[model samples]
Target: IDNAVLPAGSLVLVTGANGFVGSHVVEQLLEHGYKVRGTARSASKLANLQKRWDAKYPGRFETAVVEDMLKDGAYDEVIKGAAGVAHIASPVSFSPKYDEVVPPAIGGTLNALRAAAATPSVKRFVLTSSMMAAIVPKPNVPGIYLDEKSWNLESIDKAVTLPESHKEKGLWVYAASKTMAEMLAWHFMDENKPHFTLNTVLPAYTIGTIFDPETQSGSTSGIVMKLFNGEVSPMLALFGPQHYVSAFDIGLLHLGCLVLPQIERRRVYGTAAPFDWNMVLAVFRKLWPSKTFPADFPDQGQDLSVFDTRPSLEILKSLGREGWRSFEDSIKDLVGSEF
Candidate 1:
């Protein structure tokens, strides 16, 4: 594959710029020399980005208010003349209703693709997907471990367990939405064979000890914050499992995908550190010296692990990147920033 050069100052639009992942991506895009356009639902969300961008890189940040991605031609105006787009904005939840959650994930991609189709100069498109999109291999596979080839056939199978409305309201629908969008992107590119390329980065739980307090929008985050703060209620006592991927590393991976010439150009994954409940609790205790986590949690923790990441690691290495923060560093950051 020949080197693909995306020119400096290329207009790149990032959907969901106010989101935790989106904001990280935007920061890295700035560091990588791309002029960024960010899309969100309201002016208030844009205000935070505006303040941060002004302090760092003024006049280069553009905000587009997109109320609904499902709206016909919603993205047409956003990607006009843009060299590429990092489509990372998608629905997340504690909300169980797939009707309320999955549409935005799939619709956002469609809208972006449709808009990208119209933009003749658009050369690369990146989608933010998740590990859920692929099938989870049984623990301890004997011969070969799962990699990009391990597609989510099982998730599709599980979606069948839900009623017909599952299409509109199942946990699997979220995964289905991503699968469909990926298919659509491939089909669209194969038939149209546009000058551009499409790729995705499936991320695990993005873990970072340091999160801007304002970044806490997810329910799990609230719970984690409480636990880390030494709030020992019955609910906070349970070692609720969640994966951790550094916000900084996730950002760097997205930026790497966007700028690297002739990347593997398909689904990839990003990770930070292993999930360690005891270590987490220890740090939390140290951070909040006076407060104590529930005895049930740090004292009795469950094993939380993820898939082998050789393929993802290869991508990281090729990009000349490595995890920037250690588990200890994350704890320090959280303590320093939160306290």
Candidate 2:
């Protein structure tokens, strides 16, 4: 609670609360003595998470259903009586239809922002923007370091101009949605002048322990699980090696972004320290020496870009952590259960 923007026992509303990262944000908030009310797309989807949190933290954790985030003021009611709000949910549309993908992303962001602005008790707000919103992972792209100044305009153009049948169309569309959504969020603050501090965490490819394998075999963790089963090709595996961060670390960054008074109006990275599939394969080989995994790619060219991860790491360290969790440890955790 040191230097925390929201006071102790304050109720905080976390969107996408049943999600992997969202769940962690709730746990961290509860651990820090704050009351949490988490929102999910469905009440049934929330039963497992609600039960887990309720048993551990008792009355400190609550649950609500936010079925349609696109509707105006969707978060208005759930956000009531909350001292803080974390907008962690974003639309993930893997389609040629820009209407379905981009608009909801923007709409969801604005809805949360507007709700926070209207709420009198809210002191802090955190939005979970993606790594694609910052950059498209151009290896060795000439940059001093990544920070709040970067934006993914490249995806925006590709999403618009690329043919629907293009092999990379879906990728660009999703990236563009994230990029545009994040941009509009910052723009909303400038125009409306909300009383709350709006900070963003541009989460990279998250790799850490899964909350529930049944429900979560679809995220980056699932992608990694597929890799463990040799479901990915060597060339294709390198596509998303842009940035790396553990789920726990990213959760800490969100909590830090929300509560730290000095961390206002910032684009705090989820976690950084560039790595590639080869590095991951190396870890697998070490952990399970008896079991054979994919051969290392001859191309040792890992993500050449380095980021100024210092700021985010400083936030994590401030919250009783020694430092960022190593990629090796995250890999072990991801592969620990039922691998």
Candidate 3:
């Protein structure tokens, strides 16, 4: 695993520290010897986090409440005297109401950026943007490449037109919301040119062990668990071939963005190799043949395009990481942690 070294004892603020990706970000920061102050909707929801980390690294981690991230001044005082800010919190609800999903992602991001800009001690700000911000939710056509340059052309208008029965409608809405929120961040930076450097990490589907399994089994991790328990049918493989990165790697990317001086003010991706559901199931069966999985499964072809992921790979290499963990390794750890 890759781990970046920072100035020991530096304080870094991490928003949404209770989430699947946010928890790992906090863990990585602590592992690197940095003090962390994480924000959550309800700080008490993070008792497990505080208990688990505080025992290992006493007086190094604490939690605070930032209940309404969309509200003005939500992040103002929290940004004070921080070395860096990792904005990982976002609205994760599947509700299609534009009122529900889009505003929080956009507004919360702006509030964080605004507050960071006003804080004199802050030097870096990293946004935990999604791959949905860059890639359109469609079958990858050959001869096209996606990287930092790609922007999800999916518009709110187009997303709203999909029928309620459409399987991908909610996903499209979520993608658009991410796209719009990230776009706003870039636009704000361009217009305001805040004192701190702004970098965004766009991660693909994240999968790995849940640090606090009782509270952090997000949908992506849940799908992996279901695969082993036969709750996720092979038909779900139709959603691929899609890219994925381990949750640990996602944490590495966020830290890299915060500390890598050369790569500040850029968009980096957290992606490993691409795989379909069948490929995932094949790895599972190979690892644990003793357990019976669904024998009847569809054999679908892969539908993905090439991505220019050299930058992130280089970042990991620079940080002394061996390389990105394989999908097999990720799924194995996820299942092992649960069972």
The candidate that achieves the highest lDDT relative to the unseen native structure: 2
Candidate whose TM-score is highest: 2
Q: What shift in Å separates residue 179 of candidate 1 from its native position after superposition? A: 3.5
Q: List TM-score per model, in order.
A: 0.82, 0.93, 0.92
Quantify all predictions' global Cα lDDT against the true fold.
0.66, 0.81, 0.79
Error of 1 at 234 (Å): 11
Candidate 3, 10-92: lDDT as tens digits? 89999999988999889888887789999988977798989999998899998988999888999988887698999998876
Per-residue lDDT tens digits for candidate 2, residues 1-339, read 587888889999999888877877887888888899999888877787777788888899888999888998899889989999999886553667877788888899899999999998998999998878877676565554667788889899999999988767767888999888889989999999989898888888788877666664436776777878887832253254477889888888988988887788888887567787788888888888777787776664546555556668778878988887889899987886324
Query: Which ranges in model 1 have alpha carbons more than 4 Å from their true place?
Result: 1-4, 136-144, 163-171, 209-212, 215-223, 230-243, 286-291, 296-311, 318-320, 335-339
Q: Give the per-residue Cα lDDT of candidate 1 at 284.
A: 69
* Backbone clashes counted, model 3: 0
* Residue 197 lDDT (model 1): 76
Candidate 2 lDDT: 0.81
Q: Identify the superior model by TM-score, candidate 2 or candidate 3.
A: 2
Off by over 4 Å in 3: 1-6, 233-240, 337-339
Q: Is candidate 1 or candidate 2 better by TM-score?
A: 2
Answer with 1 or 3, whichever has the higher TM-score.
3
